[PDB]
Write an enzyme that holds these catalytic residues in place. Structure first.
Site, PDB file in Angstrom:
ATOM      1  N   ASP A  65      48.965   6.178  14.562  1.00  0.00           N
ATOM      2  CA  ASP A  65      48.586   7.078  15.681  1.00  0.00           C
ATOM      3  C   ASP A  65      49.742   7.248  16.683  1.00  0.00           C
ATOM      4  OD1 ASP A  65      46.902   8.894  17.029  1.00  0.00           O
ATOM      5  OD2 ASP A  65      45.664   7.321  17.941  1.00  0.00           O
ATOM      6  N   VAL A 107      38.384   2.737  28.975  1.00  0.00           N
ATOM      7  CA  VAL A 107      39.542   1.998  29.404  1.00  0.00           C
ATOM      8  C   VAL A 107      39.574   1.979  30.905  1.00  0.00           C
ATOM      9  CG1 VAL A 107      42.067   1.884  29.233  1.00  0.00           C
ATOM     10  CG2 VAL A 107      40.688   2.887  27.368  1.00  0.00           C
TER      11      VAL A 107
HETATM   12  C1  LIG Z   1      48.430   3.110  34.804  1.00  0.00           C
HETATM   13  C2  LIG Z   1      48.128   2.851  33.352  1.00  0.00           C
HETATM   14  O1  LIG Z   1      47.608   3.705  32.665  1.00  0.00           O
HETATM   15  N1  LIG Z   1      48.478   1.639  32.894  1.00  0.00           N
HETATM   16  C3  LIG Z   1      48.333   1.099  31.635  1.00  0.00           C
HETATM   17  N2  LIG Z   1      48.927  -0.018  31.188  1.00  0.00           N
HETATM   18  N3  LIG Z   1      48.575  -0.436  29.805  1.00  0.00           N
HETATM   19  C4  LIG Z   1      47.677   0.379  29.216  1.00  0.00           C
HETATM   20  C5  LIG Z   1      47.035   0.418  27.992  1.00  0.00           C
HETATM   21  C6  LIG Z   1      47.363  -0.591  27.113  1.00  0.00           C
HETATM   22  C7  LIG Z   1      46.770  -0.608  25.864  1.00  0.00           C
HETATM   23  C8  LIG Z   1      45.841   0.360  25.506  1.00  0.00           C
HETATM   24  N4  LIG Z   1      45.362   0.221  24.202  1.00  0.00           N
HETATM   25  O2  LIG Z   1      46.028  -0.525  23.503  1.00  0.00           O
HETATM   26  O3  LIG Z   1      44.396   0.849  23.771  1.00  0.00           O
HETATM   27  C9  LIG Z   1      45.497   1.389  26.371  1.00  0.00           C
HETATM   28  C10 LIG Z   1      46.105   1.405  27.630  1.00  0.00           C
HETATM   29  S1  LIG Z   1      47.368   1.533  30.369  1.00  0.00           S
END
Ligand SMILES: CC(=O)Nc1nnc(-c2ccc([N+](=O)[O-])cc2)s1
Length: 334
Positions: A155, A52
């Protein structure tokens, strides 16, 4: 004699009455966006089956989050995409903004809206009683919506609830374990983080439903109002169930097993031992008392029940007096 079958007591046939293409994600045809619209800025995390990144959309200079999917099964990728598209625009559901491929290597990536999240190590240290009620109500909105749309998240845990506290903004993220509910289907019990796994999962009862998410939510609530994260801290799956039984008691545990005719591994009765059901007040101290009320404990007590059929639904939970001050304050237009 096998276990007694079960089905969800709400939203039981939502996928049954929807067109095939709603829930049949293997037939979904993905429309790919342009990979060259995004620039990767820094790695935020890795686990699993993905990595990510914080990224920038260079057509409009907006921050986004990119999850590149390692070569995990095509089927799992289509399931997560179909679920994200199905839920898109629902309350506090993370927005899938784009889906892209490396055109040459064929590696897929999901692009999400960015949440500037206050780190859940800190946050839980300035949250007030009101704050918790507010954010719990927002999580419930997301769960009632995805359950009503025929989907189990599977989850629910603090890492998957992103909170941008200065904008009072909450998003439920990481739908990679989420599944469509179909009555009578036997599901994989290897889902959820250990500390948030429901009793159904820990005794290997496969015909579970949306109520699994409600157990997980109860665990989050406890950890927030008692300021102990995680609340049930087992060192493995067996021990996780022991930690639950030391609070909820073994009598109700055995009544549950007995009702569904579930067979436990011999060694469990050995390590489960025998425990009284404790009063929730037992966990109230000087340092967390400002977050605890009779309303809070009554609410928690209706979420954390062994029997998955006896837990509050998300909708019923939103009706609870714990939220009275949230709900009256949220009734507007501007
Ligand atoms: C600073 C920071 O961490 N910002 C984030 N904003 N959206 C994030 C995110 C959205 C979806 C997923 N996912 O769905 O696996 C993972 C992470 S992370």
């Amino acid at each position: 004699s096998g276990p007694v079958p079960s089905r969800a007591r709400v939203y039981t046939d939502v996928n049954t009455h929807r067109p095939r293409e709603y829930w049949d994600y293997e037939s979904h045809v993905v429309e790919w966006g342009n990979q060259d619209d995004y620039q990767l800025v820094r790695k935020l995390g890795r686990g699993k089956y993905s990595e990510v990144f914080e990224a920038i959309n260079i057509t409009n200079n907006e921050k986004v989050v990119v999850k590149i999917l390692k070569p995990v099964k095509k089927k799992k990728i289509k399931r997560e995409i179909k679920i994200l598209e199905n839920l898109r625009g629902g309350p506090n559901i993370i927005t899938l903004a784009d889906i892209v491929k490396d055109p040459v290597s064929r590696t897929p990536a999901l692009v999400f809206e960015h949440v500037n999240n206050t780190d859940f190590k800190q946050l839980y240290q300035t949250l007030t009683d009101y704050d918790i009620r507010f954010y719990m109500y927002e999580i419930l909105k997301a769960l009632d919506y995805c359950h009503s749309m025929g989907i189990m998240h599977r989850d629910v845990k603090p890492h998957n609830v992103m909170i941008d506290h200065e904008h009072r903004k909450l998003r439920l993220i990481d739908w990679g374990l989420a599944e469509f509910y179909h009555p009578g289907q036997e599901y994989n019990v290897r889902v959820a983080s250990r500390y948030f796994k429901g009793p159904e999962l820990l005794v290997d009862y496969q015909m579970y439903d949306y109520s699994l998410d409600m157990w997980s939510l109860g665990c989050m609530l406890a950890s927030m109002i008692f300021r102990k994260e995680p609340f049930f801290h087992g060192h493995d799956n067996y021990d996780q169930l022991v930690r639950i039984a030391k609070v909820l008691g073994t009598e109700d545990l055995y009544d549950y097993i007995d009702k569904y005719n579930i067979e436990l591994d011999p060694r469990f009765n050995d390590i489960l031992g025998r425990h009284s059901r404790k009063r929730w007040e037992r966990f109230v101290h000087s340092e967390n008392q400002h977050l605890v009320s009779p309303e809070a404990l009554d609410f928690l007590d209706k979420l954390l029940r062994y029997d998955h059929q006896s837990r509050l639904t998300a909708r019923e939970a939103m009706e609870h007096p714990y939220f009275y001050t949230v709900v009256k304050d949220q009734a507007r237009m501007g």
